[PDB]
Design a protein around this motif. Sequence first.
Motif, PDB file in Angstrom:
ATOM      1  N   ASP A 160     -13.480  17.194 -11.098  1.00 45.50           N
ATOM      2  CA  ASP A 160     -12.948  15.855 -11.173  1.00 45.50           C
ATOM      3  C   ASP A 160     -14.012  14.911 -10.683  1.00 45.50           C
ATOM      4  OD1 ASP A 160     -11.480  13.532 -11.436  1.00 45.50           O
ATOM      5  OD2 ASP A 160     -10.078  13.962  -9.840  1.00 45.50           O
ATOM      6  N   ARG A 205       4.117  10.443  -3.164  1.00 48.53           N
ATOM      7  CA  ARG A 205       2.993   9.790  -3.844  1.00 48.53           C
ATOM      8  C   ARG A 205       3.476   8.779  -4.871  1.00 48.53           C
ATOM      9  NH1 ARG A 205      -0.381  14.853  -5.470  1.00 48.53           N
ATOM     10  NH2 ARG A 205       1.657  15.818  -5.083  1.00 48.53           N
ATOM     11  N   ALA A 207       4.540   5.740  -3.267  1.00 51.95           N
ATOM     12  CA  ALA A 207       3.340   5.003  -2.864  1.00 51.95           C
ATOM     13  C   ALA A 207       2.825   4.199  -4.051  1.00 51.95           C
ATOM     14  CB  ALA A 207       2.254   5.916  -2.287  1.00 51.95           C
ATOM     15  N   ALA A 264       2.626   0.169  -4.102  1.00 49.20           N
ATOM     16  CA  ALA A 264       1.250  -0.373  -4.054  1.00 49.20           C
ATOM     17  C   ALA A 264       0.924  -1.241  -5.291  1.00 49.20           C
ATOM     18  CB  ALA A 264       0.224   0.751  -3.903  1.00 49.20           C
ATOM     19  N   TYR A 279      -7.410  -2.230  -4.582  1.00 49.75           N
ATOM     20  CA  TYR A 279      -6.745  -1.267  -3.718  1.00 49.75           C
ATOM     21  C   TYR A 279      -5.775  -0.435  -4.571  1.00 49.75           C
ATOM     22  CZ  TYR A 279      -8.544  -3.752   0.503  1.00 49.75           C
ATOM     23  OH  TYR A 279      -9.336  -4.373   1.462  1.00 49.75           O
ATOM     24  N   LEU A 308      -7.525   1.891  -6.837  1.00 50.02           N
ATOM     25  CA  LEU A 308      -8.080   3.020  -6.099  1.00 50.02           C
ATOM     26  C   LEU A 308      -7.019   4.053  -5.828  1.00 50.02           C
ATOM     27  CD1 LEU A 308     -11.090   3.449  -5.438  1.00 50.02           C
ATOM     28  CD2 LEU A 308     -10.453   3.132  -3.052  1.00 50.02           C
ATOM     29  N   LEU A 309      -5.819   3.587  -5.449  1.00 48.86           N
ATOM     30  CA  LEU A 309      -4.700   4.483  -5.160  1.00 48.86           C
ATOM     31  C   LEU A 309      -4.194   5.156  -6.406  1.00 48.86           C
ATOM     32  CD1 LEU A 309      -3.141   1.910  -2.931  1.00 48.86           C
ATOM     33  CD2 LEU A 309      -3.646   4.156  -2.039  1.00 48.86           C
ATOM     34  N   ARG A 330      -6.393   7.858  -7.844  1.00 48.29           N
ATOM     35  CA  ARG A 330      -6.288   9.082  -7.038  1.00 48.29           C
ATOM     36  C   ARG A 330      -4.951   9.757  -7.209  1.00 48.29           C
ATOM     37  NH1 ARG A 330      -7.050  12.870  -3.205  1.00 48.29           N
ATOM     38  NH2 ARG A 330      -5.958  12.517  -1.214  1.00 48.29           N
ATOM     39  N   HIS A 331      -3.853   9.020  -7.071  1.00 49.92           N
ATOM     40  CA  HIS A 331      -2.519   9.637  -7.009  1.00 49.92           C
ATOM     41  C   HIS A 331      -1.796   9.966  -8.261  1.00 49.92           C
ATOM     42  CE1 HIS A 331      -2.960   9.951  -2.811  1.00 49.92           C
ATOM     43  NE2 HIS A 331      -3.094   8.623  -2.650  1.00 49.92           N
ATOM     44  N   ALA A 361     -13.735   1.229   2.568  1.00 48.17           N
ATOM     45  CA  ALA A 361     -12.980   1.099   1.333  1.00 48.17           C
ATOM     46  C   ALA A 361     -11.733   1.985   1.348  1.00 48.17           C
ATOM     47  CB  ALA A 361     -13.852   1.437   0.165  1.00 48.17           C
ATOM     48  N   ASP A 403      -9.136   0.757   4.107  1.00 47.34           N
ATOM     49  CA  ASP A 403      -8.400  -0.378   3.670  1.00 47.34           C
ATOM     50  C   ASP A 403      -7.381  -0.010   2.588  1.00 47.34           C
ATOM     51  OD1 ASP A 403      -9.647  -2.007   5.549  1.00 47.34           O
ATOM     52  OD2 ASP A 403     -11.124  -2.752   4.070  1.00 47.34           O
ATOM     53  N   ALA A 404      -7.792   0.819   1.641  1.00 46.83           N
ATOM     54  CA  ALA A 404      -6.864   1.205   0.565  1.00 46.83           C
ATOM     55  C   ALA A 404      -5.618   1.842   1.183  1.00 46.83           C
ATOM     56  CB  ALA A 404      -7.525   2.117  -0.482  1.00 46.83           C
ATOM     57  N   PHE A 460      -3.329  -0.697   2.833  1.00 50.27           N
ATOM     58  CA  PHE A 460      -2.570  -1.399   1.807  1.00 50.27           C
ATOM     59  C   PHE A 460      -1.413  -0.523   1.339  1.00 50.27           C
ATOM     60  CE2 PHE A 460      -1.538  -2.902  -2.477  1.00 50.27           C
ATOM     61  CZ  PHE A 460      -1.489  -4.275  -2.332  1.00 50.27           C
ATOM     62  N   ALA A 461      -1.718   0.745   1.068  1.00 47.24           N
ATOM     63  CA  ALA A 461      -0.677   1.698   0.684  1.00 47.24           C
ATOM     64  C   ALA A 461       0.446   1.744   1.718  1.00 47.24           C
ATOM     65  CB  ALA A 461      -1.248   3.086   0.429  1.00 47.24           C
ATOM     66  N   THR A 477       2.570  -1.641   1.955  1.00 44.13           N
ATOM     67  CA  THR A 477       3.496  -1.861   0.828  1.00 44.13           C
ATOM     68  C   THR A 477       4.611  -0.813   0.712  1.00 44.13           C
ATOM     69  OG1 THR A 477       2.195  -0.644  -0.772  1.00 44.13           O
ATOM     70  CG2 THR A 477       1.599  -2.876  -0.424  1.00 44.13           C
ATOM     71  N   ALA A 478       4.266   0.445   0.999  1.00 40.51           N
ATOM     72  CA  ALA A 478       5.216   1.546   0.968  1.00 40.51           C
ATOM     73  C   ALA A 478       6.295   1.323   1.993  1.00 40.51           C
ATOM     74  CB  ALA A 478       4.526   2.877   1.172  1.00 40.51           C
ATOM     75  N   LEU A 495       4.427   9.192   4.000  1.00 41.23           N
ATOM     76  CA  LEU A 495       3.147   8.510   3.778  1.00 41.23           C
ATOM     77  C   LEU A 495       2.506   8.042   5.060  1.00 41.23           C
ATOM     78  CD1 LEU A 495       4.460   6.495   0.855  1.00 41.23           C
ATOM     79  CD2 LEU A 495       2.626   8.176   0.591  1.00 41.23           C
TER      80      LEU A 495
END
Lengths: 394, 391, 391, 395
Positions: free
Chosen positions: A345, C289, C292, C296, C328, C331-332, C335-336, D288, D291-292, D295-296, D299-300, D336
């Motif tokens: 990946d 996930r 999330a 997000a 952000y 990015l999430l 990945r997820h 990076a 911070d991500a 944010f997760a 918001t979660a 989370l």
Amino acid sequence: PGVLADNGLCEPKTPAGRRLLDLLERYLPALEAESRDNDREATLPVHLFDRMRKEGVLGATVPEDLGGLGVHSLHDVALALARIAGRDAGVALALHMQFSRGLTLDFEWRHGAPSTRPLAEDLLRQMGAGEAVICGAVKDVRGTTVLTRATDGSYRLNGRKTLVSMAGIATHYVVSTRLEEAPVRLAAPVVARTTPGLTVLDNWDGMGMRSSGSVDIVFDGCPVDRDRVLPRGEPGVRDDAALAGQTVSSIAMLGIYVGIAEAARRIALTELRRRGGAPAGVRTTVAEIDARLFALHTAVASALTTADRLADDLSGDLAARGRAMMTPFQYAKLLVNRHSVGVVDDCLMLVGGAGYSNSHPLARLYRDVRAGGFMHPYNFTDGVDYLSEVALGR
Amino acid sequence: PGVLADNGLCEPKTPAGRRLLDLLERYLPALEAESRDNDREATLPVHLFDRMRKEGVLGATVPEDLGGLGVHSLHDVALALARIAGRDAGVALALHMQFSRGLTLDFEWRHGAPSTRPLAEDLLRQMGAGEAVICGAVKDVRGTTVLTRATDGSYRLNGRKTLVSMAGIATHYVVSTRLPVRLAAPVVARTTPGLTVLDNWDGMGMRSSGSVDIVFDGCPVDRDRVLPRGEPGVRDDAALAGQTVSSIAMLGIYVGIAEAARRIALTELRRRGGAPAGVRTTVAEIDARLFALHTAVASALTTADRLADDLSGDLAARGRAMMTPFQYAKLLVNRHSVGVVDDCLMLVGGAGYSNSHPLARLYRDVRAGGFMHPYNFTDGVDYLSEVALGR
Amino acid sequence: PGVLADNGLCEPKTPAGRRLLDLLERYLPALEAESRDNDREATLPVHLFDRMRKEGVLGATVPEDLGGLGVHSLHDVALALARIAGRDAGVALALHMQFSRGLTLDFEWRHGAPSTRPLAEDLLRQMGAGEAVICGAVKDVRGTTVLTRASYRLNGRKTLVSMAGIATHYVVSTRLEEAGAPVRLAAPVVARTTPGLTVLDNWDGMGMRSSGSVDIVFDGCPVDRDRVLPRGEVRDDAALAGQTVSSIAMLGIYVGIAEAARRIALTELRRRGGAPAGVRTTVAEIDARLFALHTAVASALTTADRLADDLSGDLAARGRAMMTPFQYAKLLVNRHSVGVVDDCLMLVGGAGYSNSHPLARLYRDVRAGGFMHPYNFTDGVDYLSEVALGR
Amino acid sequence: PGVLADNGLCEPKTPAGRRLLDLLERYLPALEAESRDNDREATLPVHLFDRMRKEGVLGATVPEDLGGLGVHSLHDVALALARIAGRDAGVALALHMQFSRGLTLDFEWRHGAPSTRPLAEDLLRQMGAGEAVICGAVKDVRGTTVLTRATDGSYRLNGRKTLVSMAGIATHYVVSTRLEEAAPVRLAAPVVARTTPGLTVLDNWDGMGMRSSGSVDIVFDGCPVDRDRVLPRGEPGVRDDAALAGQTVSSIAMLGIYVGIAEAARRIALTELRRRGGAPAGVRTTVAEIDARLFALHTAVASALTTADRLADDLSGDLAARGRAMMTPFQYAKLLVNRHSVGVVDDCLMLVGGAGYSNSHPLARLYRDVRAGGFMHPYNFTDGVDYLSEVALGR
């Protein structure tokens, strides 16, 4: 040469092993050249297998006495598979069928029930000679495979097996099945390709490993000799000594995914070296990629070592011998299925869009690598059950 | 016995090594008994070190000729550290200081500049005898350590070093410093005038390790005890071999910790009966990572032990060849030992969160590795990408 | 219904949005029926696009005044794309081209340079009427796209232009060197029928196969003196607002794929009975996930929708303020979503690995996200560290 | 200000909430100043609690009618907790005891069994007045807590509860226990005064973090409980999914704490890096990532709190399903946070370097504080998996 490690699958332990890698060397450029096509077409590269069979390679795990190359080392086998997988994983996954069969029979020949010992010897010479090409047909498909006893003694075999790699060019099949009688005993009889009632179905449409020819075989009243049935124990009631055999025949496959992760890494690093200055994002990924590779290399080579250690060592508790081989195997598998996929990946994301084109090798590699997770023994679900079982006592 | 593995740090490779583990066996029940106190107090267990020094243990890496136990195997050293760390990680972290010094000197004795070769021989005999106890003082603290020439010849040493484990009970200090600016590591006795040992060690874990600060204030250093080796900035990759030898063994400690945490968690769960669907996974994950750690670490040590004496071939490349595996393993360990412990902790539950509880101690102990040079994550990345990308 | 969440992309915020989802409902069963074929073939479902264009769907982001459905909400657009992607992600990725163009023009019409304001108005009515179908052609391929002054002739090659199969116009981002005084960049509208324009059917993606992301070569194509829009040349952070508006909605798609994957895996497991210890964990992880991702993403969309019209205040900071949450979330997601799908696949087993199986299609489809600019991970890191560290 | 987000716990939704943050503002500098000491000592900052109680803060979730500040929003409560936790998490963890109790009693007062309704009303006024300070005693310790009927009728209470935060300065205790008799075996949570005879508060709180929170053990030794103060609600083993709504309301707000910790950790790490100048290729990535993940988390968590606040009053519809509908998002958020807040802190710590590892240093405190959440019921990972897979798989 990529990520190197002491006890990390980089050089062969035994001179048989060494000889084997040298033989492979001449086939690699061809394998690689043909890889895209064989993948697109989902087509087993029969022609190259012919050359290999004739040059002794399908006899690699056949003892020297019986005309084979006498590769006895699972390490070296795995390593050989890694090299081939570097160029085409489909093909490795197929050769594995042969290589492991060599070993599993070679055990039977020395340690199996006195009656079957010569049949083992027969097939081994046949493989060494380039004449026999043996596949295991294991997975039933929605309907369990059964052989029953026909009128005159002789048995008739009926069932359907799926995902049999290399079945394309097979001359025999060892078919694991249950046998119907009070008792319900299970067996793995050898069945010739030319047996009447046997059809090979070309329905192999895998997302990857496409060149491997993992086709279905249906058996419809196939005649099996009274003498070719090998009845070994029975379903459900399992013995931990069976795990040794189970280990020997699958463990080597892990080399494949190491091979794929290595290949992906190679492509990605050259690609990046070819761009010049390196952004802050890539340094980290590369470092992570390589660290995971090293973790794979070493974790795998360890499990192989354990297996090679107990391969012949039969003294001591048999049940514990199985567990002792299977556990490191399952740990390494859990690691590979997680990390080889991640490495690939990350190599993919490092190269960028071009990698996402189906023709591109990374695309092929990304689809190929996800295959390992599915392989029994064990998937993740069973893998957890086994490894928690071993850890918690029951 | 926990997670076992062929080439995974389970049994010692050499008989010196085997002898060593047997010695340690009598100390372990004590180590473990005292662990909570030594941790709460942040107190080096000096009494137990005395016994060990006197029973020959602190001379483990001292050649046989010079009266030591002749443990030459980084594998076995690491493995020993893992056993000790099972019971108290602080202590291991300290003993490492001794064990590694043994090896580093043992190299100097056979391969160092002809002049320094006897000084090495001296210190080695001294350690073997249970008389000498050597610490390295490496990290400067907000001000670089410098020795100058007292306008005659004899040098006066001035600086401050931090996080020097075992310094509590030290008799000597090898002090890496800058003096072109040429750099050197002179030996300095504990009793040297101008030398103060500061008891300001307040780490979150590794508390028993006595990683105290040492200030040097115009300390007299013999004209002969200065060993000038290259110069800062312009680095040579052959130095990496030495750098490897003196740290790699520490990795055994974190393996030790993870193992310990695992043992605790597992027995705890066994003692509960039926096992929920949550735990089976965590256990399986825990062990898998442990197996990864064992083997990844034991592999790096193997590489290191292989090139330890092998001096023929390109020296620059020998350094790289040792350091790289080391850094991969270290990257893995710093990630996974911490994970294993975290998971062991969550597996056991609330009780593990009491500071008195061994897991609590272990969780705080394990986080130490990440900080150790060479290398932390940032440098780790730079190095390992450099090796990988050509530059 | 899957994983539900307040402010998590589950129901549409505006009644335009609501109207839009209802329209889509009749197309979904067809989309899903055709998905395997369209995928195997790598074939844009032109027939279904005709029906949708004629049923007003391709005018969804065209204001009510100009005969479109007046969907102004990025949230709702995203949400729509998730529904469609549930059935076929290639298709969603194509419609996105239309929906986003709707909004980007609608901004121009109200806030663009007075001159281009009626052109915008034109194309908008055209799209609402079901007459116009607009694709952006952005990525150059080994050779930058340039128009020069002959009226201008346009020369270049653009890659991965989705829906270009059935396009009627192309907005083409390019740099200009009008045979004179250097050097400014522009996005002229170009008709499909323009002479010198070839559409190359070379779309061989591993996934998103039904999206028709073909190459367009321009070979001395005639562009009106009036259709050139020269904007700047040295980047400005206010551009980031536009940049955001035109991509952010796409994140709906990956949420869609993850949801689909989850639905399949769950029903498949429900159908097996007792649930092993390994799957309870994976399911819990998958759903966590997903939650999330949902939250997000919906959050970033909310920020984008908030500043969509709000033009008062520092324009440079408006861009940053939209783009950062977007990045952000991206990015999430990258990945997820891929992880959730990976996990759904491993939960279902071998069958999922057959190319014909929807999971296999979904696994190949989901990986597409990570490549999309703005930003991939490398740039993504640069941008997000830049914002965090000052420079 | 750190990582900002719309619907991400940054500003309070309601004016009661706003009012509450403003009050807190004057306590923060003190909280922060004392944080190292309170932590090293493992000492609840009683003096600061006195000021807060008297300035009305301990009645924040007590309705306006009963003289409290009428904060009804779980979002805003969580947010408040996040601010405080920014300076001292132990303290937030204690105040939570008060704030949640306010809400849980406020529900009873309006919707509990007609008999208990005035008792609820009593305690609420008491909290509003700065007179009453109520802790829950929930976790038994190697021996289940039982109250029986003293031959007279009046009940005598016997057992031991653990990890009861803020019990230091408590005036009452709601004690969840089972009552065994005749069987059936019914369960209840009676109110018990601090001054009740037979009640001992044990100062044995030796946590690795949250040290200032005073999570001490309370032993009850034949404590007299009024015939009227027993509230019998259902029975163990046989659970009802509507209970999940109450269970949600009383813990969900805590998640603001760990967000608070992660934010704090991030703030410290970033200033520290800004102070170093040029930024290596290793750090850019970590920043990076940090911070991500923040944010997760933001918001979660704010999402789950919104769900909770939505159904807080909405009682029409299936009660069993209302619980599930609250608890699920909560458990997702929790899973989370226990993963990511710990990671963010870990990474902030590795970004700062060795200094961070000194026990006196705030990061060290933060790293030991953050690991607390994973343990909190409902639910840990094990049960969390069980619950979440149950909801997903049908059974």
